[PDB]
Structures are given as structure tokens and as C-alpha cells.
Amino acid sequence: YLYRLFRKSNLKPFERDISTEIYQAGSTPCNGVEGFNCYFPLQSYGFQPTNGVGYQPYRVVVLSFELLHAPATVCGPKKSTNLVKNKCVNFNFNGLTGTGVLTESNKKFLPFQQFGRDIADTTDAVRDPQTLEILDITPCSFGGVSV
């Protein structure tokens, strides 16, 4: 298990660096070999089984994703139900949680697009996951009421 001890600049996010060029600590280049004031950029960890807590090897994983803007492929553990149409429910289309009647639609979604937003930036077009079809949404608490 090794770590990059020296680099002439810090990284950008999500950038890998597996180079092994010798890092010139001094101002004099040493033509890529080891010597004085120019050191090997990688250093190996020392993980003894009986060394301090701050030196014990820790396994890390990072799950990086982006939510509710593209066709989902990973789904949660929830079991699906059958949608109740022309009546307003607590729907759940690939993660979003709202309230409103649903209706059919005939918009021409590009294959790489899965959502559709109106001027207000709210959802006005959706694609059902199981059934490939384009629909639209409206609220149900609507209409003014004068007394």
C-alpha cells in the first residue's frame, strides 16, 4: 500500500496520478534518478498489526452519484406498486416524492433524456420506468374557491 509523497502541484477532483517521475525537491534536476534533493515520489505505508490507531489501515469506499436528472439504472430496494391514475397520490417515479394527478402525453423525449421541466423548473413530463411511455403531471389541489 503506497501513497504519493510528493507532487509539484495538488490534484483536481477525481483525478488519478500513477506517474513515477522523480520529484526535484532541489532546484538542480537530477535527470530522473535518485540522489540528493530529488526523491522518489511514492512512499510505502508501514502497517504493523500492533501499531497505533492512527496508523492502522482503514478501508474506504466512496459512492459517487447524481440524483434525478438522467435515466436511472440503479434502483432502491422498494417493491413497486400499480399507479392509480386520474387521482392524486404520493407518487414515486425513480426517487422523486410529490403529490399530483398524472395524465398521458405525447412529447418526443430524446433517448438520453428521462425528465422534462417547465418554465417553473418543476416536473411537467416524466417517463414511467417499467412501461416506456411519456406522461405529464398536474396538481390536484388546484382552482380558486370563493365563498
Binding site: 436528472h69 412529447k107 422534462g116 413530463a125
Partner: protein, 42 residues
């Protein structure tokens, strides 16, 4: 290696109304959306 070469000065051309990409993956119709990003200048 290839050596049958004849160098010339770098030729230039005017690129106009080119280098526009969809900035996201959301369906959007009848909207005058504005964005700021790495775009090819007109």
C-alpha cells in the same frame, strides 16, 4: 517514420455559430434558457 512532407504555414478559418452542445440531460421545450460554461465563441 514518415518523411515525404511539405510544411506550410498554419491555415486559418472562420468558425461561426458552431460548438454548441446540450448542457444537461433534461427535456425542455419553448424556453429561452441561458447558460454559462466552456463554449466555443462565435
Amino acid at each position: 517514420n514518415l518523411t515525404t512532407r511539405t510544411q506550410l504555414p498554419p491555415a486559418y478559418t472562420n468558425s461561426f455559430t458552431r460548438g454548441v452542445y446540450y448542457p444537461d440531460k433534461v427535456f425542455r421545450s419553448s424556453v429561452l434558457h441561458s447558460t454559462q460554461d466552456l463554449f466555443l465563441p462565435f
